[PDB]
Symmetry: D2
Subunit: 116 residues, 4 copies
């Protein structure tokens, strides 16, 4: 998978299930173009967002809809979303896992980047 | 001080000094309007961004220019910047501290929301 | 796997490979008895520490040897290790993934707990 | 103040108040000898643990009684406590702040090590 997202709930010690994720790519005119979206599975993972061909060089924004997740669980959280912005593939194709750990007033995010 | 930002460096175990921070407020047309900005001090803190009168309820984005910070230290970073997007709510406590802990491929952020 | 450990390097954006991990279980006399040990693979994962039969109720300490990891990479870090202490299996068997994210002066740790 | 501890709650976005903190120093026989202790204040901070004269180089353990904190708030926690084990080094800066961010199934810790 060239781009995978994994999300964990720090209150429950579980995968964060059914979290909406939107990926954007910065366009030539500096706007954020919709690139891919999906929602995390029962494992907290989102696979299948893109393909090697379509995941070209660029600046990407992964927007994890944390508010919609907490509100569905009946919780009022602090953040609107968690947003990971990075340049991808600029020295050739890489595989990226974007991981996030969610609490109502906090989040942590990291990237695992590998060369196939 | 209704809004403060504090930034640490997890690689050096030190405040993150001279990091640019931009705060935006979401406008009615969903665009991000500049609201306040500054650079973190020797203590990693940015005070004086706004006033009680100016800081009304709404959605704010705090963008921390982490890429330039790491580059100035000679370290290769993953993110373009760190973003913190949140709603200010008058129903809650009245002082917001946005804290961030920076590593080259990760970051953590939390909100400390208190009343004097 | 009843107990798995995963470790990630926040400076490199990679698995943390060849990290030594020692698990202890608190004995009747309140000392920490050696329970299992191993080291993370190329994927940053440590499987095979224990079995369902041998992983009984108790208070466990997972000690991740972060200093030895950083020093092997030629880095002087702050912590001696990262230490995760928790009661396991006290309402019947569970599966535990202990995750850690390492920086030279920081670390983060979370648990994914599932019921088989 | 050569050693300070600050603790936040990631669920409430607030200092972690009245959390017990115990500091130990490693003795020659590898046992942990009590060194200092206290409870975090209304600001989540614990000052006055030691003095420059008492705080010599060595290995220290800071144990934060997170389980009791969460229980007092009616929240089910994973960890027995959070531990931070580190070496004090005179070669480095002279003031240590040990910071921790608490969630029920996770915690993060960092060191802010500075000179006056
Ligand atoms: C170690 C890593 C990167 C991870 C990567 C993959 Br892929 C996984 O499947 C799992 Br479970 C963990 C991780 C992620 C988050 Br979220 C954390 O809060 C912490 Br601490 C560590
Ligand atoms: C920036 C830093 C190190 C911090 C240091 C001091 Br001293 C403070 O008073 C505050 Br308020 C924040 C911090 C600490 C934690 Br615990 C975090 O989860 C994150 Br994110 C950042
Ligand atoms: Na290139
Ligand atoms: Na029981």
């Amino acid at each position: 998978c060239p781009l995978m997202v994994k999300v964990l709930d720090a209150v429950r010690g579980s995968p964060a299930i059914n979290v909406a994720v939107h990926v954007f790519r910065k366009a030539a005119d500096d706007t954020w173009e919709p690139f891919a979206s999906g929602k995390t599975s029962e494992s907290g993972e989102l696979h299948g967002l893109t393909t090697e061909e379509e995941f070209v060089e660029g600046i990407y924004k992964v927007e994890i809809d944390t508010k919609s997740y907490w509100k569905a669980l009946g919780i009022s959280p602090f953040h609107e979303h968690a947003e990971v912005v990075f340049t991808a593939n600029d020295s050739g194709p890489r595989r990226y896992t974007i991981a996030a750990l969610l609490s109502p007033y906090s989040y942590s995010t990291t990237a695992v980047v590998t060369n196939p």
